[PDB]
Amino acid sequence: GAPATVTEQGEDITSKKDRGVLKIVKRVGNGEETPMIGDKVYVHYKGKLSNGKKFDSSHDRNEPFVFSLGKGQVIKAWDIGVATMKKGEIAHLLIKPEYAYGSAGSLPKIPSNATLFFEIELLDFKGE
Ligand SMILES: C=C[C@H]1CN(Cc2ccccn2)C(=O)[C@@H]2CCC[C@H]1N2[S@@](=N)(=O)c1cc(Cl)cc(Cl)c1
């Protein structure tokens, strides 16, 4: 399925080149610009655990998730990954725990040592 495919066929987008965050672009977005640090980013997403469980989805809430890019409001992989996306892009990310919730996990939904899969759509970015 899609998690296996990004694991086996994704590109390493980390600065360290440690394969901690792999990406596939599913739908090419608009032009060349990506958001900058501090921008208000609007995304839709779905997240899955390695046991197959969908653990979260913004689509199911009928509202995007909004955050300020690069300010540590989200897991490291999101700050890294969303920064690579163009407006309108849809991407898959495969994230090792070191770029997510690590050995702690995040109770109740995220186990210890969890590799995470996301599908993310960048709706809009604005501001700083
Ligand atoms: C909807 C909440 C976000 C939670 N966070 C930030 C955060 C804040 C506080 C505690 C744990 N994580 C995050 O960094 C990431 C990425 C942005 C979307 C979503 N998560 S998430 N989908 O991984 C998620 C979803 C859910 Cl239901 C629980 C957790 Cl602990 C994490």
Side-chain angles (χ1 to χ4, degrees), residues 1-15 18-31 33-39 41-52 54-70 72-75 77-108 110-125 127-128:
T5 296
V6 57
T7 300
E8 291 175 342
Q9 313 290 335
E11 184 177 296
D12 184 357
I13 61 163
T14 66
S15 64
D18 59 14
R19 295 188 53 93
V21 185
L22 305 173
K23 182 183 181 196
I24 296 173
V25 175
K26 296 290 289 178
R27 183 178 68 201
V28 173
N30 308 153
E33 193 177 7
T34 64
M36 73 171 285
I37 182 166
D39 283 349
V41 298
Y42 290 69
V43 301
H44 269 303
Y45 73 92
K46 176 184 38 67
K48 302 187 88 170
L49 302 181
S50 55
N51 68 5
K54 170 171 70 182
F55 67 89
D56 201 31
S57 167
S58 60
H59 297 279
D60 293 341
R61 285 187 293 268
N62 303 297
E63 65 173 47
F65 178 75
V66 178
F67 69 107
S68 295
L69 185 64
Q73 292 183 355
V74 293
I75 55 169
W78 269 53
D79 273 341
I80 297 163
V82 172
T84 72
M85 295 181 71
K86 287 84 158 190
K87 183 174 170 175
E89 179 178 318
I90 303 176
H92 288 179
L93 301 178
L94 194 286
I95 303 162
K96 301 309 289 178
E98 299 76 11
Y99 291 83
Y101 296 102
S103 48
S106 190
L107 297 320
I110 310 298
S112 183
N113 299 323
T115 291
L116 308 179
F117 168 84
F118 292 91
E119 178 170 90
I120 303 174
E121 177 176 355
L122 179 54
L123 303 165
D124 202 12
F125 59 92
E128 294 192 40

